[PDB]
């Protein structure tokens, strides 16, 4: 009751009334009301990172956030937060940064009290025990043990390592069961006392801020927040910070050499700069990020492209701790790009000095400020989970008025800070880092935490005084006036024939359409997407490889044009599929035609630059062979969708059939692919119907004019179908992951086709085991960190699956899955009516839920139009069938389909094992699959789903 805000800045598109305040104990509280929401939520952000861990025990903050979810004294049950939150269509999640720790959930329609009061005790009073601390560090160990091979983490910790080893930046965030358990009892340090001291010292103070997305009012919930969060008492803890940047001049001007595990080639150029979070009005770092990392005509990337050294390069300024902040120009490299690193960085300082001679530009600021103002004014709707975590996560920095207008509004263009940061970019401040697998035998030093190898090649002053000596220009220039900036923001009125679902309007043997004027959102922007079909796109591996090569070189040769469209708010995406290729163009309403037209005329009338093809061919050949370095459970989810389909090609087919693709073969392939084809599309958003038919008309008329496109026969518009497993069939086959020390498994229970009375059986059974599967297989039995079980739907055929990867041998996992099945059905027959109706209501709220963003319903329409079912109202009738179900119905579903003694039982298993690798029932002897095609030769195939 200390501080109340009067009115803050909101975009005039929103309808959500807001209120900010501050409590007696110094908590920054923000209130959000929404009358028409369906999942309310709240969040919290304690401003304490893993950079306040004690020096002896490493990764205490992460172990504490990981242990706080389990157990309080006002709710002594182990899972009562998770169990009550999952009975009511909610889900909870959390993470730790280097500076703070976010706690957030979401919950159903009005269950604010019963989950917010459970979320408040989180900090009011927590209770731990021996059991939890003893079996939770195993899950944190699995967490680190899956990230010991992740090159996004190995490079991160190696940047943390080679700095100032007396600095708190050189600290480890996770804990690997060794710093958490083995070291503290090696020297007798207790852990529970460390956790109670950490929490009572840091978390209970003023530091945390809260936000809650309520339905009721802006006075109904102010009282609710005050009563719950008044207790936590201010301990007057000042914010931890440190003005000393970790890079002292002894370890500046240095060039390491790192050896990865997955085959990559990269070049990092690191600059240190002082803190610029205080300047959030002029924002000099975004200016220099816009001027350094900018593709287009005559810019830093395009010249390095033209010399064949660089694929791409991301610039910008990288944040750090509170006191300091980085600046990075991160590049990737070609085969002969690693020979010319000094010339690459020479061109980088050529472009720096060419941007240091011209000086600060006001029209670039005005352009960027207009673009951020237009991008703020038509800001789309937000999902209430994830959003409240962000705006609680940035609430510590800004006052009450601009809590929302963060990095959107800019007041002044002050060139003095532009010159300051542009002076701090000097080759006396460089730290180059090269990653290449060509350094196998040359590295002396190795990392202890992760186990990576690197060097110290401190750059002698030859190449420094080659960098800053004489820098006039190459052929660089500043970017020009943008022409894709929008000017038409008029919402077209709803026409006479206004439909709630997309209607077939054109139906020819060449194309078909699906059109809906936007009725709910009223934003001047409309996405539109296409699915072109060709029977020659996936005939053999070679024809499945020219497709990716052609599509990629099309995307390569058009980035130069359309980066200004992606910068103004028009984004496209063009990738291949099994059946044909794909296109999806979204963004502001004014320049979809210009862009789509240029994409089509660049698609049909397409030449090949030979050296670019010869670069991309190798960048794909090195994108096939590093599939062996990736997660085990992803190899399970790859192998299952390879075996359970009609035709699919392995990663071993395509790298053999890349030894045949040549320039003339690909060059003759595009007239073969674009000769006969068929288009399927929906158009959605703010467009009239005559202009919709004109847009797709112009599309197929351009393909007619340039490609000589003919329509396909209707008897060769076909899809693929799923193999039918025998009743009482037990199929398993194992493969061995080469580089990960974990094992993995995915098990598949196949029921039947897509019906309107049979999707709710499997869906309700997958909702009744959603919380207990996690609860007994990851928490109680500690089988690993990757636990997931749900419905899988490919080719119409629906199945219930289990994804789990662990240290244990996989057949142990499959046995304890069967034990979970038996214990689960025993728990099903015991449950009462009220809990069963609670599960039915939880599924009737998760599934009967309107989408907020316009792309969230365009991905609801398109994802079923590409499945050829065309059932738009399956969200109403299906859940109207869900309301009439009896307790017996699910047992009758379970017994003859999913049980061990079942007559209709379909089960296939994929075991991925490692590099060197409470009463389970009796399982029948497996039959193993040693060949995929001889497997799929003796089994029937399902019929395809008839459309609606």
């Amino acid at each position: 009751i200390k501080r109340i805000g009067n009115h803050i800045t909101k975009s005039p598109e929103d309808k959500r009334e807001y209120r900010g305040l501050e409590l007696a104990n110094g908590i920054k509280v923000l209130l959000i009301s929404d009358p028409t929401t369906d999942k309310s939520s709240a969040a919290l952000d304690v401003h304490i990172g893993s950079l306040s861990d004690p020096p002896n025990i490493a990764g205490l903050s992460h172990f504490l956030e990981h242990m706080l979810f389990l157990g309080t004294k006002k709710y002594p049950k182990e899972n009562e937060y998770s169990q009550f939150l999952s009975e009511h269509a909610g889900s909870s999640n959390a993470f730790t940064s280097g500076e703070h720790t976010n706690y957030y959930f979401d919950v159903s329609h009005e269950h604010l009290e019963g989950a917010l009061d459970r979320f408040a005790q989180f900090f009011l009073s927590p209770l731990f025990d021996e059991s939890a601390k003893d079996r939770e560090v195993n899950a944190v160990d699995s967490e680190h043990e899956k990230n010991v091979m992740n090159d996004a983490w190995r490079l991160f910790q190696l940047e943390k390592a080679t700095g100032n080893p007396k600095h708190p930046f050189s600290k480890f965030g996770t804990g690997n069961k060794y710093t958490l358990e083995t070291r503290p009892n090696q020297e007798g340090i207790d852990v529970r006392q460390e956790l109670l001291k950490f929490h009572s010292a840091y978390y209970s103070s003023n530091l945390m801020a809260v936000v809650v997305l309520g339905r009721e009012s802006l006075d109904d919930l102010t009282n609710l927040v005050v009563k719950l969060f008044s207790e936590v008492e201010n301990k007057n803890v000042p914010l931890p910070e440190f003005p000393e940047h970790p890079f002292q001049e002894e370890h500046l001007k240095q060039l390491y050499k790192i050896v990865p595990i997955k085959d990559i080639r990269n070049l990092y150029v690191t600059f240190p700069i002082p803190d610029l979070q205080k300047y959030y009005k002029s924002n000099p770092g975004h200016y220099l990020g816009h001027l350094i990392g900018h593709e287009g005509p005559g810019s830093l990337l395009s010249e390095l492209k033209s010399k064949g050294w660089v694929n791409t390069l991301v610039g910008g300024q990288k944040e750090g701790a509170r006191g300091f902040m980085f600046f990075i120009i991160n590049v990737d490299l070609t085969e002969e790009g690693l020979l010319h690193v000094e010339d690459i960085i020479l061109h980088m300082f050529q472009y720096i000095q060419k941007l240091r001679a011209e000086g600060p530009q006001e029209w670039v600021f005005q352009e960027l400020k207009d673009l951020n103002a237009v991008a703020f004014r038509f800001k789309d709707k937000e999902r209430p989970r994830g959003y409240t975590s962000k705006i609680a996560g940035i609430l510590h920095y800004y006052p009450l008025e601009e809590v929302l207008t963060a990095e959107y509004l800019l007041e002044e263009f002050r060139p003095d800070l532009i010159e300051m940061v542009l002076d701090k970019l000097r080759p006396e401040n460089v730290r180059v880092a090269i990653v290449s697998k060509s350094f196998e035998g040359k590295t002396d030093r190795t990392e202890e935490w992760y186990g990576t190898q690197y060097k110290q090649e401190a750059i002698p002053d030859e190449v420094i005084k080659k960098w800053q000596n004489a820098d006039l220009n190459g052929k660089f220039k500043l970017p020009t006036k943008n022409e894709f900036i929008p000017t038409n923001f008029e919402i077209l009125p709803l026409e006479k024939e206004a439909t709630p679902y997309p209607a077939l309007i054109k139906d020819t043997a060449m194309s078909k359409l699906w059109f809906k004027q936007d009725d709910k959102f009223f934003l001047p922007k409309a996405n539109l997407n296409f699915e072109f079909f060709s029977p020659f796109a996936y005939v053999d591996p070679l024809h499945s490889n020219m497709a990716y090569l052609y599509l990629e070189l099309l995307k390569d040769s058009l980035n130069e044009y359309a980066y200004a469209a992606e910068l103004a708010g028009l984004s496209y995406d063009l990738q291949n599929t099994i059946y044909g290729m794909y296109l999806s163009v979204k963004g502001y309403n004014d320049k979809q035609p210009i862009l789509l037209k240029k994409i089509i005329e660049k698609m049909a009338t397409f030449e090949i630059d030979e050296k670019r093809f010869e670069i991309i061919k190798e960048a794909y050949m090195r994108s096939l062979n590093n599939f062996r370095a990736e997660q085990p459970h992803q190899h399970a989810m790859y192998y299952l969708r390879l075996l359970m389909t009609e035709v699919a090609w392995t990663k071993d087919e395509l790298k053999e059939a890349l030894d045949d693709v040549t320039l003339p073969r690909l060059k003759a392939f595009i007239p073969q692919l674009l000769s006969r084809l068929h288009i399927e599309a929906l158009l959605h958003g703010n467009i009239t119907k005559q202009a919709a038919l004109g847009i797709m008309q112009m599309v197929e008329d351009t393909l007619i004019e340039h490609a000589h496109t003919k329509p396909l026969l209707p008897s060769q518009l076909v899809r693929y179908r799923e193999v039918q497993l025998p009743d009482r069939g037990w199929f398993v086959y194992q493969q061995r992951n080469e580089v990960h020390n974990n094992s993995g498994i995915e098990i598949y229970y196949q029921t039947d086709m897509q019906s309107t009375s049979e999707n709710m059986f499997l869906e309700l059974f997958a909702q009744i085991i959603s919380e207990p599967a996690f609860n007994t297989l990851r928490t109680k039995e500690q089988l690993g960190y990757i636990v997931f079980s749900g419905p899988r739907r490919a080719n119409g055929i629906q199945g219930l699956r289990f994804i789990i990867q662990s240290e244990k041998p996989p057949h142990y996992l499959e046995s304890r899955v069967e034990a979970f099945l038996i214990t689960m059905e025993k728990s099903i027959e015991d449950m009462t009516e009220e809990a069963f109706q609670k599960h039915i209501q939880a599924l009737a709220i998760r599934r009967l839920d309107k989408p907020k963003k316009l792309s969230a319903e365009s991905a609801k329409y398109w994802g079923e139009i590409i499945s050829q079912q065309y059932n738009f109202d399956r969200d109403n009738t299906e859940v109207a069938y869900l309301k009439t179900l009896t307790k017996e119905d699910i047992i009758k579903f379970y017994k003859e389909m999913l049980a061990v003694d079942a007559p209709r039982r379909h089960k296939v298993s994929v075991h991925v094992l490692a590099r060197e690798m409470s009463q389970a029932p009796a399982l029948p002897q497996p039959e193993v699959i040693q060949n995929m095609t001889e497997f799929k030769r003796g089994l029937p195939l399902f019929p395809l789903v008839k459309p609606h």
Binding site: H286, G289, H294, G315, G316, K318, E319, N330
Partner: peptide, 5 residues
């Protein structure tokens, strides 16, 4: 491209 990070 700019480093949004």
């Amino acid at each position: 491209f700019v480093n949004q990070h």
